[PDB]
Structures are given as structure tokens and as C-alpha cells.
């Protein structure tokens, strides 16, 4: 019975530690930052299981799990474990969560703001790679923070009036949609640069980064057109006048 | 009811750990009388054609139930019998309909994320493909990634 | 391995008959080196889930075959039985650790068609009234209608 119990331990501690490393915080989830909050958080709970299948009553389990001859139900639990693994990644995350690029590129509304926070999240893509985080995840959080300095010029733009504005103001409100569209394109660029030097320097998992760019071009054309609009209606004004 | 006990005594034997024939604890969730119900129910009721069982091990105290509802627990089994037929007569067995499977015995996060993935899409996605779908694994596939984005 | 083929004779092959237990082309199909194989892949790898057995009447004799692949064959009366959890054994928590699917005998696309707008999309039902699941459901109703037209 007690090698039962240890062996069923020792496959409960193994499906915890999959459920742990389970919640992938890929550069799929969220933003920039948000991928690496949630990087950071599955380092942190195969760390969790690391921890609970390293520790001195898990061990004892698992020596009276091997006494009883549960050798299967330790193998099975340490390979499902994956405490190593989930270790690997938080320290990798170590070198790449660390910063706030992402947020910086949405709270920048004005273009130069844009392209700081842009290059910021590209910068702490660029520090993962070169750390053990991934290529692709540098490339995320670079996507992350170009994406996030589109959506703040689109919510400044919104706000402010960039399209509703009339010649002088709708010219300013496009000017500011286009440089954030740009701030957020140049992020992108720097966060695909961290995420080929990451793939490059890791050729044997990672083959390259993600191409991250933001998600605005759209924007930042029709701001530009209505600025144009607002130059020929001034210009067909000044010939009616004339 | 008599492939759904059997389905309770040996196909319950077949899922678990190491291999061989009916535990302790799967004894004890046959043994339950909610258990004799929901398999009466499956062999009779068209309306009621779900069906539970549960062969827990936490310490070590043996401590499950047989339901006749669908349940999910961490490090831990209840069965949830989806049928897809209503009835059942009294010929040849039937344990196929409302068949003794569930989700995992895992964390039920990453094994509903996992499901919601690759169990019920693929299905619509072989069905198509055999005969949309590709819009109903797509969003098993977002709502599966949303839940794993939710609980990280 | 043989626990799994002890449970696909007990619950699989048991799809278009009535109520009983395992009969001889149950045991027929599990028996197959094939069909040892599968259950044996189901029983340790976690990604090898489904496992089919068959109880068919071609023209009406008792013989089919049962493998991890699931297919509509001729009175093909299978039942994907599929793994969700890490291995498929006897000592842990019952087959409550598993993944529910059932099969018919004909083409199985209508079939699956009626248990997405009746079991899967119920599913999501009970998931709201238990609390992206409202696009699971529309786009489930969607590959439901989709199914229909194509099959129509």
C-alpha cells in the first residue's frame, strides 16, 4: 500500500507539474508584456514542481515509491514533471520578461512615445534572445509592442479627433496616427532584428523570430490623405476666392 | 445496463496506471447504489443517458463517487457518459452510446485546453474532409487558447 | 494492451447493438496483433488516444477489426474510446480518465452532425448556465448547418 501511495504521488506530483508548464505563455497570449508575464508565470509554477518533486517529503515518496519497486510510476512521474524544463524557462524569461517595452509603446500616443516603447520591447526581446528565452519569444514581445503602440495612436486618434478634426487639427491627428503607425512598424522591425539574431545564435531549436510588426499603415494613410483633402480644399478655396 | 456494469468493472480497469484488472477503489464506485441507478438510467431512461464513476486514491483514503452527471476534480476521474443514442434494448451489449469515458485525471486546465483543441475540431474537421467545420476548429481552437491565456 | 482490449470488447464494439455484453467479433477485432499494438499504444503513449472495436454486420456475419484508427466501414459499429489522460491502465483512477466519442455503423457524418447540435453545443449550454464558449456554440451550429447542406 505504501508503494501504491508512492507511486501515485509521484504520478500526481508529474501531472502537476504538466499542468504547471501546461498554460503556455507563448508570444500568443496577449501583448508583449502579457506573453511575458505569462512566460514568467510558467517558469514560476515548473519551478513550483521542480520544487515540490525536489523536496525532502517528495523525495522520501519517491525512495519508498522505488523500495516498493513503483520504478515505472517514478519514471512516468519524471518525465511528466518536467521541473528542469519549467526551471530552463524561468531563467530564461530572467533575461527577457524583465522590462515594460510594450506598455511603453501603448502609453506613448504621440509617435516618438510610440517608437520608444516599440524599441524598448524590441531591446528586451533582443536581451531574451541573447539569454536562454527564445528567438520567437523576442519576436512575440517585439509584435507585442508594435501592436500595442498602433492601438494607443488608433485610441488617441480616436479620442482627439484625428479623423473628425477639421483641416489644421485632422491634419495633426493623422500626422500623429501616421508616427505612431511608424513608431509601431519600427518596433516591429527591431523586435524581427532580436528574433533572427535569437534564432541565429540558438540555430538548434530556434530558427528565427517572428517578423512582429505592429497592427496602423491604414491609419496612418488616411491621416495623411486627409491632410492632402484639407490642402486641396484649401487650394480650391483660394481659386473660388480668386 | 449489464455492458454499462461491466463497463464499470473491466473497461474502468483499462484507463489508469499500470494494467490488469478491477482496483479497489473502481470496486467501490460499482459497489455504490447511485452507480446501480445511473446505470438502470443509461439501460432505460432516453432522457437521462449519462452516467459517472469514480475510483479516487488521495491520501492513502479511498474517497469517489458514482454520479449520473458529468464531474472533473484535480489528480482525479469522474466519468460523464455522452450518448449519442437515447435508448437501449435488451440484446447485445451496450456500452458504446453512453460510453464509461470523460476528460483526463489531470489538472482539468491544460486537459480541457487540450481537448477543446484537438477532440472535438478534429472530429468536424475528419467529418468535412470525408464528406463550417473549419469554422468550428477555429474557434475550439481560440476559446481553447483563451482558456489557457486566462488561467496563465 | 489487454485491459484495452478487454474494455473495447466490453464497451466498444457495443455501438448499433442493444444490451449485454462482449460478443465474439469483439473479441475477434481486440484479438488482431494490430489491435494489441494500439491498445498497447494507447495504454502507455499519451498522444496514440483513440482506440476503435467493432461489432459489424456486412451482407450480417459477426467480423470486423479493431485498431487505434477510427473509419466508416461497412457496418462499421466502432467506438472511438480516445485518451485524454497520460496512459491507459488499470491501478489509478478509473476510466473516467479518458476521452468520449461513439460511432455508428453507417456514414458517420450525419451522425456527428446531430451530436454537435445535441451533445457538444449542449456542452457549451451547460458550461454557460454552470457560469469564447457563445463562438464555440455559433460556430458548432454553424458546422452543424454546413454539414447538413453538404450531406443534403
Given at each position: ?93 530572467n533575461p527577457l520578461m524583465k522590462d515594460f517595452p510594450l506598455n511603453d509603446l501603448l502609453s506613448a500616443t504621440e509617435l516618438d512615445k510610440i517608437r520608444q516603447a516599440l524599441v524598448a520591447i524590441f531591446t528586451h526581446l533582443r536581451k531574451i534572445r541573447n539569454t536562454k528565452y527564445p528567438i520567437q519569444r523576442?519576436?512575440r514581445l517585439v509584435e507585442a509592442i508594435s501592436r500595442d503602440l498602433s492601438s494607443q495612436l488608433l485610441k488617441v486618434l480616436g479620442t482627439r479627433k484625428l479623423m473628425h478634426v477639421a483641416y489644421e487639427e485632422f491634419e495633426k491627428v493623422m500626422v500623429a496616427c501616421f508616427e505612431v503607425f511608424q513608431t ?59 | ?152
Amino acid at each position: 500500500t505504501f508503494l501504491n501511495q508512492l507511486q501515485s504521488g509521484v504520478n500526481r506530483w508529474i501531472r502537476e507539474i504538466q499542468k504547471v508548464t501546461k498554460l503556455d505563455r507563448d508570444p500568443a497570449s496577449g501583448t508583449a508584456l502579457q506573453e511575458i508575464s505569462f512566460w514568467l508565470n510558467l517558469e514560476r509554477a515548473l519551478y513550483r514542481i521542480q520544487e515540490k518533486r525536489e523536496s525532502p517529503e517528495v523525495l522520501l515518496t519517491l525512495d519508498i515509491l522505488k523500495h516498493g519497486k513503483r520504478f515505472h510510476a517514478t519514471v512516468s512521474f519524471d518525465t511528466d514533471t518536467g521541473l528542469k524544463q519549467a526551471l530552463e524557462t524561468v531563467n530564461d524569461y530572467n533575461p527577457l520578461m524583465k522590462d515594460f517595452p510594450l506598455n511603453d509603446l501603448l502609453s506613448a500616443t504621440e509617435l516618438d512615445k510610440i517608437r520608444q516603447a516599440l524599441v524598448a520591447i524590441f531591446t528586451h526581446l533582443r536581451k531574451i534572445r541573447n539569454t536562454k528565452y527564445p528567438i520567437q519569444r523576442a519576436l512575440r514581445l517585439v509584435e507585442a509592442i508594435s501592436r500595442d503602440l498602433s492601438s494607443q495612436l488608433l485610441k488617441v486618434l480616436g479620442t482627439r479627433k484625428l479623423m473628425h478634426v477639421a483641416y489644421e487639427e485632422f491634419e495633426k491627428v493623422m500626422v500623429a496616427c501616421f508616427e505612431v503607425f511608424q513608431t509601431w512598424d519600427d518596433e516591429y522591425e527591431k523586435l524581427q532584428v532580436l528574433l533572427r539574431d535569437i534564432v541565429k545564435r540558438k540555430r538548434e531549436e530556434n530558427l528565427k523570430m517572428v517578423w512582429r510588426i505592429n497592427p496602423h499603415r491604414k491609419l496612418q494613410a488616411r491621416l495623411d490623405q486627409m491632410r492632402k483633402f484639407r490642402r486641396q480644399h484649401e487650394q480650391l478655396r483660394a481659386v473660388i476666392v480668386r | 445496463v449489464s455492458v454499462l456494469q461491466k463497463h464499470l468493472r473491466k473497461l474502468v480497469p483499462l484507463l489508469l496506471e499500470d494494467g490488469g484488472e478491477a482496483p479497489a477503489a473502481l470496486e467501490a464506485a460499482l459497489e455504490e447504489k447511485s452507480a446501480l441507478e445511473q446505470m438502470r438510467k443509461f439501460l432505460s431512461d432516453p432522457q437521462v443517458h449519462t452516467v459517472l464513476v469514480e475510483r479516487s486514491t488521495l491520501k492513502e483514503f479511498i474517497s469517489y463517487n458514482i454520479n449520473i452527471d458529468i464531474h472533473y476534480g484535480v489528480k482525479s476521474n469522474s466519468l460523464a457518459f455522452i450518448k449519442r443514442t437515447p435508448v437501449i434494448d435488451a440484446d447485445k451489449p451496450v456500452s458504446s452510446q453512453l460510453r464509461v469515458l470523460t476528460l483526463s485525471e489531470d489538472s482539468p486546465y491544460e486537459t480541457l485546453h487540450s481537448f477543446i483543441s484537438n477532440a472535438v475540431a478534429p472530429f468536424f474537421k475528419s467529418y468535412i474532409r470525408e464528406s463550417m467545420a473549419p469554422s468550428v476548429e477555429k474557434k475550439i481552437a481560440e476559446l481553447e487558447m483563451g482558456l489557457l491565456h486566462l488561467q496563465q
